[PDB]
Amino acid sequence: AKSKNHTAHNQTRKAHRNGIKKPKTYKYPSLKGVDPKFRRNHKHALHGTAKALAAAKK
Amino acid sequence: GKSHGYRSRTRYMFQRDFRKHGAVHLSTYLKVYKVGDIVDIKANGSIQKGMPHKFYQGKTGVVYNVTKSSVGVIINKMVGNRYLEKRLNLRVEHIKHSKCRQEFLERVKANAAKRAEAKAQGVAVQLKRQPAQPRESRIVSTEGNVPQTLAPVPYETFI
Amino acid sequence: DAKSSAYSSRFQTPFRRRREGKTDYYQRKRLVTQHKAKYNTPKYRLVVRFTNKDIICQIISSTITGDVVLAAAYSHELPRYGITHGLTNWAAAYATGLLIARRTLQKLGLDETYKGVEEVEGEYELTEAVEDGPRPFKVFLDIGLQRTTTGARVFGALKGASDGGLYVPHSENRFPGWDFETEEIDPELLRSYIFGGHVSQYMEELADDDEERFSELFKGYLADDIDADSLEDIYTSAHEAIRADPAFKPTEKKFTKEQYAAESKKYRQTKLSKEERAARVAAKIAALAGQQ
Amino acid sequence: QNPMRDLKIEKLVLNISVGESGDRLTRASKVLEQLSGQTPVQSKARYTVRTFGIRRNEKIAVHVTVRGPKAEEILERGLKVKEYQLRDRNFSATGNFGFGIDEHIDLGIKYDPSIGIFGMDFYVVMNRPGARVTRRKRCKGTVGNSHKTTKEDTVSWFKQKYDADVLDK
RNA sequence: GGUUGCGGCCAUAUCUACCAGAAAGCACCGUUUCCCGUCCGAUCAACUGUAGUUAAGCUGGUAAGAGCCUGACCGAGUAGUGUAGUGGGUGACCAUACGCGAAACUCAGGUGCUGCAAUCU
RNA sequence: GGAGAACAGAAAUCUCCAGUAGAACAAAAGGGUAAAAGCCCCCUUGAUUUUGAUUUUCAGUGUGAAUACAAACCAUGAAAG
RNA sequence: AGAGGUUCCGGGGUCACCUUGACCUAUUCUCAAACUUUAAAUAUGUAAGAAGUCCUUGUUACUUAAUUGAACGUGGACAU
Ligand SMILES: [Mg+2]
Ligand SMILES: [Mg+2]
Ligand SMILES: [Mg+2]
Ligand SMILES: [Mg+2]
Ligand SMILES: [Mg+2]
Ligand SMILES: [Mg+2]
Ligand SMILES: [Mg+2]
Ligand SMILES: [Mg+2]
Ligand SMILES: [Mg+2]
Ligand SMILES: [Mg+2]
Ligand SMILES: [Mg+2]
Ligand SMILES: [Mg+2]
Ligand SMILES: [Mg+2]
Numbered sequence: 001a002k003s004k005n006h007t008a009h010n011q012t013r014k015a016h017r018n019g020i021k022k023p024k025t026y027k028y029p030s031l032k033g034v035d036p037k038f039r040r041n042h043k044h045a046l047h048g049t050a051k052a053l054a055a056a057k058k
Numbered sequence: 059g060k061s062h063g064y065r066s067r068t069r070y071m072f073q074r075d076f077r078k079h080g081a082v083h084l085s086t087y088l089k090v091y092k093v094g095d096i097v098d099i100k101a102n103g104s105i106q107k108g109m110p111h112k113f114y115q116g117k118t119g120v121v122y123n124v125t126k127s128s129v130g131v132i133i134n135k136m137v138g139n140r141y142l143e144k145r146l147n148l149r150v151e152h153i154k155h156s157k158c159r160q161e162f163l164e165r166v167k168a169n170a171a172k173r174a175e176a177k178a179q180g181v182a183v184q185l186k187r188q189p190a191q192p193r194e195s196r197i198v199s200t201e202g203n204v205p206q207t208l209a210p211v212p213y214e215t216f217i
Numbered sequence: 218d219a220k221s222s223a224y225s226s227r228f229q230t231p232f233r234r235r236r237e238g239k240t241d242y243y244q245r246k247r248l249v250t251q252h253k254a255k256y257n258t259p260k261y262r263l264v265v266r267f268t269n270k271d272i273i274c275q276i277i278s279s280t281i282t283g284d285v286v287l288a289a290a291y292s293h294e295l296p297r298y299g300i301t302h303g304l305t306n307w308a309a310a311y312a313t314g315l316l317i318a319r320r321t322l323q324k325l326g327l328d329e330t331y332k333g334v335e336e337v338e339g340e341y342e343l344t345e346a347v348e349d350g351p352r353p354f355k356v357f358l359d360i361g362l363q364r365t366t367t368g369a370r371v372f373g374a375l376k377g378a379s380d381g382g383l384y385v386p387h388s389e390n391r392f393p394g395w396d397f398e399t400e401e402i403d404p405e406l407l408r409s410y411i412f413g414g415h416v417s418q419y420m421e422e423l424a425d426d427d428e429e430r431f432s433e434l435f436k437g438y439l440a441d442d443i444d445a446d447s448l449e450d451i452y453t454s455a456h457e458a459i460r461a462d463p464a465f466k467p468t469e470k471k472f473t474k475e476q477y478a479a480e481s482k483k484y485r486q487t488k489l490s491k492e493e494r495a496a497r498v499a500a501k502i503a504a505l506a507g508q509q
Numbered sequence: 510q511n512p513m514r515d516l517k518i519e520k521l522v523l524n525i526s527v528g529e530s531g532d533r534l535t536r537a538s539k540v541l542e543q544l545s546g547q548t549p550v551q552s553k554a555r556y557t558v559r560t561f562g563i564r565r566n567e568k569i570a571v572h573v574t575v576r577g578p579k580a581e582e583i584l585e586r587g588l589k590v591k592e593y594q595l596r597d598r599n600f601s602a603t604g605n606f607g608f609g610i611d612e613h614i615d616l617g618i619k620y621d622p623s624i625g626i627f628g629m630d631f632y633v634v635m636n637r638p639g640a641r642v643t644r645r646k647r648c649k650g651t652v653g654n655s656h657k658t659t660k661e662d663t664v665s666w667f668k669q670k671y672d673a674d675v676l677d678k
Numbered sequence: 679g680g681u682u683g684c685g686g687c688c689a690u691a692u693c694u695a696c697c698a699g700a701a702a703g704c705a706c707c708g709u710u711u712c713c714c715g716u717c718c719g720a721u722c723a724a725c726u727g728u729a730g731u732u733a734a735g736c737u738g739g740u741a742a743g744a745g746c747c748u749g750a751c752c753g754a755g756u757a758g759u760g761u762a763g764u765g766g767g768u769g770a771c772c773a774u775a776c777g778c779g780a781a782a783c784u785c786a787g788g789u790g791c792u793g794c795a796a797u798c799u
Numbered sequence: 800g801g802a803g804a805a806c807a808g809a810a811a812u813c814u815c816c817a818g819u820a821g822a823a824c825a826a827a828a829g830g831g832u833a834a835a836a837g838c839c840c841c842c843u844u845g846a847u848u849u850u851g852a853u854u855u856u857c858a859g860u861g862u863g864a865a866u867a868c869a870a871a872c873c874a875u876g877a878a879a880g
Numbered sequence: 881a882g883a884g885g886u887u888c889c890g891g892g893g894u895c896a897c898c899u900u901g902a903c904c905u906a907u908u909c910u911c912a913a914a915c916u917u918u919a920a921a922u923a924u925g926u927a928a929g930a931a932g933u934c935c936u937u938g939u940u941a942c943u944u945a946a947u948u949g950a951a952c953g954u955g956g957a958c959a960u
Binding site: 069076077092093096098099114116117118119120124133156158159161162163165166167169170173174177182184187 | 929
C-alpha cells in the first residue's frame with residue numbers, strides 16, 4: 001500500500017517542545033579517552049600534592 | 059540503492075583548494091596544542107589518516123587530549139532534542155587554533171591593563187564592549203561641496 | 218619554452234627550496250615534527266652539509282618564524298686547530314663534528330659531564346647516560362639531500378659528534394669498515410679514516426707510482442713539508458686542540474657591515490620606477506616609429 | 510669565447526636492436542662487450558606488437574654507453590665506415606648526432622665464431638662543461654640559453670676536427 | 679648590501695627573451711688508490727682546493743612581456759537572494775517595500791618579504 | 800609531443816629537449832598524491848599480542864568499517880620517524 | 881563563424897602551381913544536475929571570562945639536555 005515514506009515535518013517542533021539541551025559542562029571532566037601515560041602520572045602527581053598539602057597543614 | 063558511507067557527499071569539501079595542493083607546510087606540525095585550547099576543524103584531504111567525519115568540518119571544539127600526532131577535540135553534536143559530547147581523535151593536519159579565542163585573550167589582557175590603569179588613577183573605566191551606537195549631531199559644511207545632483211534617468215536601451 | 222597562459226595560470230610552484238633543490242620537505246616533516254605531548258620541546262638536528270671547499274655542521278631547532286641555530290661549526294676554522302689541508306675530507310668531517318659537539322656541550326653547560334670518547338679507537342660507541350645525572354644532549358642527524366653510502370663522510374660528522382659527547386642516535390653500518398658480506402664493522406679501518414689514513418696511504422702511493430700526480434695533488438703538503446705519516450699526529454693534536462677550547466672565536470671581519478653594505482651597493486642594479494619605465498616605453502615608441 | 514664554452518662528448522651510446530631474445534642477442538652482447546670493454550645492458554620491449562615478433566619484457570635489444578677518450582676512439586672507428594660523411598639530418602635539434610653502421614667491420618676482431626653480421630647505431634651526446642647542473646641531485650637547475658648545444662654548434666664542431674662534411678652524397 | 683647553511687609564508691617568489699655581477703661565498707671544474715655505486719667515476723662515493731673558469735648554475739636588472747598578487751564610488755548597489763502585501767500579469771514572469779550583496783570585466787599599483795647563524799672591499 | 804639514430808616503418812630499442820600530472824595507484828565513481836601515495840630495487844611480516852577509549856550508520860544498541868593512544872614484541876632506516 | 885601559418889602528414893593539378901582537409905596561432909557566437917578560477921543571500925560552528933586573569937612556587941613513576949614543560953595545586957592580588 002503506497003503511502004508517505006519519510007518526512008522531517010514536525011521534528012524540529014517536537015525537538016523544541018522540551019528545548020534543545022546543552023550537555024551541562026562540569027568542572028573536573030572525566031579522564032575517559034585522555035592519554036593513559038598522562039593519567040598514570042596525574043594520579044601520582046595528585047597523590048603527592050595532597051600528601052604535601054597535608055604535611056604542610058596538619 | 060542509497061549510499062551513506064563515511065566520505066559520501068564529500069566531493070568538493072575534502073578537495074584541495076586550487077593551487078594549494080601537495081605537501082602540508084611545516085607550521086601545521088610546529089603549532090602547539092594544549093588541553094583546553096579551542097580549535098577549528100577543517101579536514102586536509104591529502105592526509106587520510108585521522109580525518110574527521112564530514113559532520114565535523116567547520117565545527118569548533120575544545121581540546122581534551124593530546125597524543126603523539128593528534129589531539130582529541132570535544133564537539134557538541136545536536137542529536138534529536140539534545141546535544142551530545144563527541145570526542146574526536148584528529149591528527150593535527152585537520153586542526154588549527156581558533157582566532158576568535160586568540161583575540162578574546164588579547165581582549166582579556168587589554169581589559170586587565172585598562173583596569174590597572176584606572177586603579178593607577180581614581181576614575182572608573184567602563185570596560186564592556188558596546189554596540190554600534192546611533193550617530194551624533196553633525197554640521198555638514200557646503201564650502202566646496204554645494205549639493206548638486208539631478209533627477210532619475212530616462213529609459214534608453216543600449217543593447 | 219613559450220608556455221601558454223593557461224599553463225602559467227594553473228601552474229602551482231613548489232615551495233621555494235624544493236624549487237631551489239635544497240630542502241627535502243618529505244624528510245623535513247619527519248625530522249622536525251615533535252610529539253605533541255612533548256609540547257614546546259625543540260627537536261635538534263645536526264645539519265651536516267658539504268659544499269666544495271667547506272663542511273658545515275649546525276645544531277638547528279625549528280620555530281614558525283624560522284629555524285634557530287644553537288651552535289654551528291665550520292671546517293674552515295679547523296686551521297686554528299691545526300688542520301690546514303683537505304678541509305672537506307672524511308677526517309675534517311670528523312673534526313668538525315667533534316668541534317660542534319664540544320662547542321654545544323660547553324654552551325649548554327654539559328661538557329664536564331659527557332666527555333665522550335676521549336681515546337679514539339674507531340669503535341661503534343654510542344653516548345650513554347650518566348646515572349642520576351642529566352641525560353646526554355639528543356641530536357638527530359640531518360644529511361639533507363645527499364645519499365647514504367657506506368663510508369660517506371656525513372657519517373664522519375656523525376661519528377665525530379657522537380664521540381664529542383652528544384647522544385646522536387645511529388647504527389654502525391654506514392661507517393667505513395662495514396662489510397656487506399658479514400654484519401660486522403672494521404674498527405681499525407674506521408680509525409684510519411678518522412685520522413686520515415686513507416689520505417696518507419694515497420700520499421705514500423702517489424709518490425711511489427708517479428711524482429707528477431703527487432705534485433698536482435698534495436702540492437700544499439710539499440709546500441710546508443707535511444710528511445705523509447704525520448697526518449695521524451696532526452688530526453690527533455687537532456682533536457685535543459678542539460677539546461681544550463671549542464669556544465668559537467669569530468673573525469675580526471677587518472671592516473664593518475656598514476662599509477660592507479656601502480661598498481657592495483655600488484654593484485647592485487637598482488630597479489627602475491614608473492616614470493622612467495614609461496619614459497623608456499614612450500621613447501621606444503618614438504624611436505621605433507619615427508618614420509625610421 | 511670561453512674555455513668552458515667548449516663542445517665535448519659526454520657519451521657515445523652504441524645500440525643493437527635484435528627483435529628476439531636468447532642466442533642471437535647473447536652474440537649481440539658479446540660484440541658490444543669486446544668492442545667497448547664494458548659489459549652492455551639489455552633492453553626489454555615496452556609492449557607487444559606481434560608483427561615485429563616481440564613480446565612484453567622480452568629483452569629485445571642491447572646497448573652500451575662509453576664516456577671519456579674511449580668514446581672518441583670508437584668515433585673514428587665508426588666514421589671510417591661512413592667515409593667521414595654525414596648528412597643534413599643525423600644531427601638533432603638539441604645538438605646531438607648519430608649514425609648507423611654495419612658489419613662492425615674489422616677493428617679489434619676476437620676469435621670470431623659463426624656469429625653473423627651485426628649492424629649497430631652510434632649516438633653521440635654533446636654538451637659543454639657545466640652540464641652537471643641538470644644531472645646533480647642537489648640544486649638541479651637548467652642550462653641557460655647561451656650554453657645549450659644546438660645543431661649549428663655541433664655541425665660546426667663536426668665540420669671542424671674530424672675534418673668531415675655533411676649533406677654531401 | 680652581497681653570499682652561504684638551515685628555513686617561515688609558499689609565484690609580488692613562477693615562466694619566456696636578453697643583459698650585468700667588484701669582493702667573498704657558491705658553483706662548474708681536476709683525480710680515481712681507498713669507502714661506495716654504476717652498462718658508463720655522467721649521477722652517487724672518495725681525494726685534492728691543486729690545473730682552470732665566471733661560460734653555465736646562482737643573484738640582480740630590463741620588457742607599453744605571459745602569469746601571479748593587491749586595491750578601486752571599475753562594472754555594480756548590477757546579477758542573485760532573505761523578508762512583505764487580498765501587489766501587477768491569463769501565464770511566463772515582473773515591479774515595489776525592508777535587508778544582504780557577488781562574479782567576469784575595466785583601470786591603477788606591484789613583481790618577493792623575512793627569521794637564526796656564519797662570512798665578505 | 801618534438802628532433803635525431805642500419806635493418807626500423809605509423810608503431811621494436813637507443814639519445815636529447817619540452818612536459819603541474821594531461822600517467823599510475825587491483826576493481827565503480829569521487830577525493831588525494833611528483834626527490835610521492837606512481838616506477839624500479841633492498842630488507843621484511845605490524846595482515847602479530849592484550850585491554851580500554853573514540854568516530855560513522857546509532858536507540859547514541861548490535862554488526863561492519865575506521866581513528867588516536869597505552870603495555871609488549873618486532874620490521875625498516877644512518878636516523879628522525 | 882570566418883582570418884594568418886607550404887606538406888609523399890595519400891589535396892587529384894610543377895613529373896613547385898586558382899581548384900589545400902585536418903592541425904597550429906590570434907580572434908568569434910552560444911552553453912553544463914553529475915564542469916570550473918571565482919562566488920553570495922538564507923541557513924550554520926565557536927568565543928564574549930570567577931571553573932576567569934596575573935604573580936610566586938608545590939607534586940609527579942609523564943616529559944625535557946636541564947623543575948624544561950605538561951596537568952593539578954598552595955599562597956597573594958583583581959568583585960560600580
Ligand atoms: Mg507510516
Ligand atoms: Mg550519495
Ligand atoms: Mg573547498
Ligand atoms: Mg631521505
Ligand atoms: Mg667527474
Ligand atoms: Mg660527490
Ligand atoms: Mg604583465
Ligand atoms: Mg618577477
Ligand atoms: Mg588502484
Ligand atoms: Mg583526482
Ligand atoms: Mg620515497
Ligand atoms: Mg558496510
Ligand atoms: Mg542543483
